[PDB]
Amino acid sequence: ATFKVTLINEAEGTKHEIEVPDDEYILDAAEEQGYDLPFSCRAGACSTCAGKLVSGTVDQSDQSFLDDDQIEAGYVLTCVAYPTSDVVIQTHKEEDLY
Numbered sequence: 001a002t003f004k005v006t007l008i009n010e011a012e013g014t015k016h017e018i019e020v021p022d023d024e025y026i027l028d029a030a031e032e033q034g035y036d037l038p039f040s041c042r043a044g045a046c047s048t049c050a051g052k053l054v055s056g057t058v059d060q061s062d063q064s065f066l067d068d069d070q071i072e073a074g075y076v077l078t079c080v081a082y083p084t085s086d087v088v089i090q091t092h093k094e095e096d097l098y
């Protein structure tokens with residue numbers, strides 16, 4: 001499957017539509033398609049690449065920084081998140097979390 005992922009940067013008021021394989025991380029696909037996004041460790045261990053879901057689901061089982069309450073609130077570490085549906089996600093959300 002290949003899922004439609006919509007990246008929303010609220011502070012800048014931008015929207016980008018990308019297509020992400022079910023076996024590729026969202027951040028990697030975004031970059032390949034010309035859309036740079038924040039990151040540092042690329043290993044699910046910091047919050048630099050955090051996003052927040054608007055709709056849809058991800059598999060971010062490789063992540064280790066976010067706690068269960070943050071996951072239930074919709075936060076996602078985009079560097080280790082595979083889409084499992086079409087997704088709409090707000091990017092640049094780390095400031096929510098520090």
Ligand code: FES
Binds near residue numbers: 038041044047
């Ligand atoms: S860049 Fe560190 S968790 Fe994603």
